[PDB]
Amino acid sequence: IAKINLLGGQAKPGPALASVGINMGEFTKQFNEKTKDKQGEMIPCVITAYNDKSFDFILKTTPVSILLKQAAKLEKGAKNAKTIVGKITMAKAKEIAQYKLVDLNANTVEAALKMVLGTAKQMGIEVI
Amino acid sequence: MKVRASVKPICKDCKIIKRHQIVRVICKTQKHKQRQG
Amino acid sequence: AKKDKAQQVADVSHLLSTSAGFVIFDYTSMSAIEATSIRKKLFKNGSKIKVIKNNILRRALKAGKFEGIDETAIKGKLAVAVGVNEIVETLKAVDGVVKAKEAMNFVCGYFDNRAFNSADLEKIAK
Amino acid sequence: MLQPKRTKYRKPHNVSYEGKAKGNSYVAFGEYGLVATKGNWIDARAIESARIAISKCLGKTGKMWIRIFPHMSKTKKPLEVRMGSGKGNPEFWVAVVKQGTVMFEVANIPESQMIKALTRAGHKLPVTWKILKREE
Amino acid sequence: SSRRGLIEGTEQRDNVQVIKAKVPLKEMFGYATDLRSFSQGRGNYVMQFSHYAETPKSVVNEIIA
Amino acid sequence: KIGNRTITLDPAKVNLNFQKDHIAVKGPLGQIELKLPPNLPLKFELKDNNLQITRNNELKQSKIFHGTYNALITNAIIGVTQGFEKKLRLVGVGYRANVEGETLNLQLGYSHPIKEKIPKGLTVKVEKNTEITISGISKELVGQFATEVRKWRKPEPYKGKGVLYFDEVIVRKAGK
Amino acid sequence: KTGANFERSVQSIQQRLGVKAVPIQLPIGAENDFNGIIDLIEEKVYFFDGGKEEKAEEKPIPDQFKDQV
RNA sequence: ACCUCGAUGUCGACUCAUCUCAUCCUCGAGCUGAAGCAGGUUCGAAGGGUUCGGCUGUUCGCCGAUUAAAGAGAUACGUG
RNA sequence: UACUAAGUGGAAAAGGAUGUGAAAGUGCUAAAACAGCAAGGAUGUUGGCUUAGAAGCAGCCAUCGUUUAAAGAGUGCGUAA
Numbered sequence: 001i002a003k004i005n006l007l008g009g010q011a012k013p014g015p016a017l018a019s020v021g022i023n024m025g026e027f028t029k030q031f032n033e034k035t036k037d038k039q040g041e042m043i044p045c046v047i048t049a050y051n052d053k054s055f056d057f058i059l060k061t062t063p064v065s066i067l068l069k070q071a072a073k074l075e076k077g078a079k080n081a082k083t084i085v086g087k088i089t090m091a092k093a094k095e096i097a098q099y100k101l102v103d104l105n106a107n108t109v110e111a112a113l114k115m116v117l118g119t120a121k122q123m124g125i126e127v128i
Numbered sequence: 129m130k131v132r133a134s135v136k137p138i139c140k141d142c143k144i145i146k147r148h149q150i151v152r153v154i155c156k157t158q159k160h161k162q163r164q165g
Numbered sequence: 166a167k168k169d170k171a172q173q174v175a176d177v178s179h180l181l182s183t184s185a186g187f188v189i190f191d192y193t194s195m196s197a198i199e200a201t202s203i204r205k206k207l208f209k210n211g212s213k214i215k216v217i218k219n220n221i222l223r224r225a226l227k228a229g230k231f232e233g234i235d236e237t238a239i240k241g242k243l244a245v246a247v248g249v250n251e252i253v254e255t256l257k258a259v260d261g262v263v264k265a266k267e268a269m270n271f272v273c274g275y276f277d278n279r280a281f282n283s284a285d286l287e288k289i290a291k
Numbered sequence: 292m293l294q295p296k297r298t299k300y301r302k303p304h305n306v307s308y309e310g311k312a313k314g315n316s317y318v319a320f321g322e323y324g325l326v327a328t329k330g331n332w333i334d335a336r337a338i339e340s341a342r343i344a345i346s347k348c349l350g351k352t353g354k355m356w357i358r359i360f361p362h363m364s365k366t367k368k369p370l371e372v373r374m375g376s377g378k379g380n381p382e383f384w385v386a387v388v389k390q391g392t393v394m395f396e397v398a399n400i401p402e403s404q405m406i407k408a409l410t411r412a413g414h415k416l417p418v419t420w421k422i423l424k425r426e427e
Numbered sequence: 428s429s430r431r432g433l434i435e436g437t438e439q440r441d442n443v444q445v446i447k448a449k450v451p452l453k454e455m456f457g458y459a460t461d462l463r464s465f466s467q468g469r470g471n472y473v474m475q476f477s478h479y480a481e482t483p484k485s486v487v488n489e490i491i492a
Numbered sequence: 493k494i495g496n497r498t499i500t501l502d503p504a505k506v507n508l509n510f511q512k513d514h515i516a517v518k519g520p521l522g523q524i525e526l527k528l529p530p531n532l533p534l535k536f537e538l539k540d541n542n543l544q545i546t547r548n549n550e551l552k553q554s555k556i557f558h559g560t561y562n563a564l565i566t567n568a569i570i571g572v573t574q575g576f577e578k579k580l581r582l583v584g585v586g587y588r589a590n591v592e593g594e595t596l597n598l599q600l601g602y603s604h605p606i607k608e609k610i611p612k613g614l615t616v617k618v619e620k621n622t623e624i625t626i627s628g629i630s631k632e633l634v635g636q637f638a639t640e641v642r643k644w645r646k647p648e649p650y651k652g653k654g655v656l657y658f659d660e661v662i663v664r665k666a667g668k
Numbered sequence: 669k670t671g672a673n674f675e676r677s678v679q680s681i682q683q684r685l686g687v688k689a690v691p692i693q694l695p696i697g698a699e700n701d702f703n704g705i706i707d708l709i710e711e712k713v714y715f716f717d718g719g720k721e722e723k724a725e726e727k728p729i730p731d732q733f734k735d736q737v
Numbered sequence: 738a739c740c741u742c743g744a745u746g747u748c749g750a751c752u753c754a755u756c757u758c759a760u761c762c763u764c765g766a767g768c769u770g771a772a773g774c775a776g777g778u779u780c781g782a783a784g785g786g787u788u789c790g791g792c793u794g795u796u797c798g799c800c801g802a803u804u805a806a807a808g809a810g811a812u813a814c815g816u817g
Numbered sequence: 818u819a820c821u822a823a824g825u826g827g828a829a830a831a832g833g834a835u836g837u838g839a840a841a842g843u844g845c846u847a848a849a850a851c852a853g854c855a856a857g858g859a860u861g862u863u864g865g866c867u868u869a870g871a872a873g874c875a876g877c878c879a880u881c882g883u884u885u886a887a888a889g890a891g892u893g894c895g896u897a898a
Contacts, residue, residue: 167845167846167848170848171848174848192856192857193855193856193857194857195856195857196859197857197858197859197860197887197888198859199859200857200859200884200885201859201860201883201884201885204884204885215885216885217886218848220848223848240855241855242855242856
């Protein structure tokens with residue numbers, strides 16, 4: 001419900017952030033305070049029905065998408081998915097999979113790495 | 129109803145029935161009603 | 166194919182005969198998200214939360230020497246946890262599922278191939 | 292225009308098209324084709340119209356061949372003259388079709404757009420259409 | 428949607444949704460009064476000149492023919 | 493396939509009168525007298541505890557016949573054992589309706605008084621001045637009455653305004 | 669005129685405006701039967717006519733309204 | 738070129754009109770990019786109605802003003 | 818002995834026909850087949866971009882993958898989001 005792709009900074013300027021009945025600042029305070037660690041870095045945001053949308057939230061462990069962007073060594077948007085640009089290897093693939101080791105609900109190294117390739121071969125890098 | 133002499137399924141839910149030996153169609157789409165197929 | 170149906174029935178008969186413990190409890194709405202939550206909890210357990218047809222589970226059970234002829238006529242979504250290789254932790258998880266629903270009646274199965282009353286099997290589970 | 296280079300006579304006997312297909316009795320180049328259930332006259336204007344219609348629906352990679360081409364002439368008297376002073380002046384060009392004759396073939400084109408083009412051709416010819424495939 | 432457009436989402440100033448519109452001035456005249464008509468006057472619009480952009484062929488028709 | 497379907501029965505709540513001219517099912521929730529014309533291909537059996545009517549002949553019109561007679565048997569059984577009810581909302585600004593004795597009034601765009609008589613075997617109940625409930629023993633008659641009430645007003649896209657069937661979310665059009 | 673009710677009006681203003689205002693009177697009728705005004709701090713006034721309004725007298729409430737008053 | 742050329746009385750106007758519906762209007766109804774009015778679409782329905790003046794012999798046509806409405810036609814392009 | 822539910826018979830172009838029989842092939846299948854219904858339908862993922870704002874359905878490059886009976890950048894409906 002209302003997937004939210006926002007940084008770790010201000011939770012005020014999100015129009016789709018407050019659409020299920022939740023207010024803006026009442027969480028934004030603690031959101032900023034506890035996400036000052038990675039302010040300027042993305043932190044995905046989703047929500048579930050609490051009882052009446054008085055206050056609820058859940059922050060997601062970051063999937064490798066900004067690190068997967070620099071895995072291609074390009075800071076430009078990837079409208080070219082069949083082009084293998086950037087270097088990724090089993091060592092780097094496993095390092096990336098460490099991030100998503102807890103991020104996914106099916107737990108095993110090979111399958112999580114297959115997730116990383118499947119999301120990454122379409123990233124704009126035909127990964128190893 | 130649309131005055132024509134050859135009607136074929138034009139929306140995905142335009143199904144053809146024959147009422148009293150007059151061929152007509154039924155569909156949710158209201159721009160797709162016609163008879164005398 | 167019907168011959169394929171028979172050979173699959175034989176294969177799952179062999180599977181249940183080989184497997185000592187196994188529990189199949191009918192779920193309303195067995196949910197995939199909480200299913201893979203179970204999968205994280207089970208991890209590399211010999212158990213495999215799985216979903217196969219309910220008629221094959223009749224003829225599997227009636228080929229594979231386990232008690233109950235009218236106990237197989239369950240109606241609805243059925244998923245079997247084959248308890249083995251940490252069968253206890255599988256029992257723990259399936260009783261956690263028992264407490265995750267309204268109240269799920271004992272359909273079939275037991276800890277290691279000897280079914281009895283289910284007022285204590287859940288206590289082995291927790 | 293589909294006007295032949297030269298004609299020995301401007302004022303010929305057209306055809307007796309009540310007979311089985313003399314030539315072009317089967318598709319030769321493409322994989323599917325339109326065939327006439329019976330024979331009749333066709334002008335040149337409608338041949339050009341059918342060609343352009345099938346070409347608009349033709350892909351940039353598909354190719355199409357025509358079998359029947361205007362060889363005969365067609366004459367009409369003015370609407371003020373009584374019966375018989377001579378023979379008038381030819382107006383336009385006409386080709387003959389025998390029963391079972393094929394006229395259009397398409398190739399290097401998807402089969403769905405193939406049947407699309409065949410329907411487009413059929414909706415424009417007075418002769419009754421029928422659809423076949425390249426047998427060999 | 429019909430005037431070179433800015434309909435690519437929503438922009439909000441944290442309590443008021445201010446939407447940008449890079450719109451040619453020729454298409455402002457009936458635009459603003461009809462926007463007030465349709466919106467029941469519950470909004471407004473600010474006068475700021477963006478830039479000198481390309482003229483559409485509709486206005487080019489009167490250049491030469 | 494609808495052929496000799498399983499139609500359950502409890503021969504104490506409702507009693508049956510199976511005749512070649514009228515089928516009379518009677519119980520505490522009234523009686524239903526299904527009228528069936530003479531010269532029918534179907535044969536009726538004296539049965540209880542899931543009565544089933546079989547087919548003596550196999551042909552298209554007879555097939556449709558059996559399907560429809562079985563469906564109407566189901567309809568009449570559930571009617572005589574449970575009854576039928578329909579409910580209709582009325583979405584408007586000044587629209588309303590209420591009851592006088594056995595007649596439903598209507599307040600509509602009409603500047604002229606509108607009342608409609610209630611057919612026999614059915615009863616109306618008012619809970620809010622616009623939404624009405626009609627309860628009787630026949631789905632046939634209750635639907636006919638619902639259409640009769642609807643016939644005076646049709647919902648339109650530019651504004652929620654009409655005889656809503658409690659579950660119809662109509663398409664919307666945005667003019668002015 | 670059609671489309672109005674005193675309770676409806678005060679409810680609408682309370683929700684959409686946050687007016688937090690106080691009523692003084694209560695019309696009698698729904699949309700056409702406006703022939704008297706219940707008064708809250710004092711007695712209801714019954715209007716003997718329509719678009720004339722020249723004879724105003726303040727008559728006792730029948731208790732189906734005075735309790736809510 | 739087929740009866741009527743040992744007689745078929747052929748334009749136009751007045752009057753009398755009768756009939757058809759591919760309906761001009763009143764009528765029913767659907768649909769709409771049908772806010773509403775104001776619109777278009779065609780299915781039914783021929784029950785009824787379906788003007789007055791200027792112009793040149795007039796049909797045609799144009800014009801003037803005007804009606805809920807200022808039809809297309811058939812009847813020796815109606816009626817000596 | 819078959820067809821017609823069209824008074825076809827007892828007139829006819831183009832096209833349309835899920836009207837209906839007969840014929841020769843032809844998939845599943847009492848182990849539930851075909852529906853409809855009772856239930857899930859996950860997951861990187863609002864894949865990457867775009868227009869500050871487009872992010873399963875504005876659109877383009879991809880259009881691949883884990884758990885799994887299966888889950889599709891989704892089958893369509895919903896907003897500029």
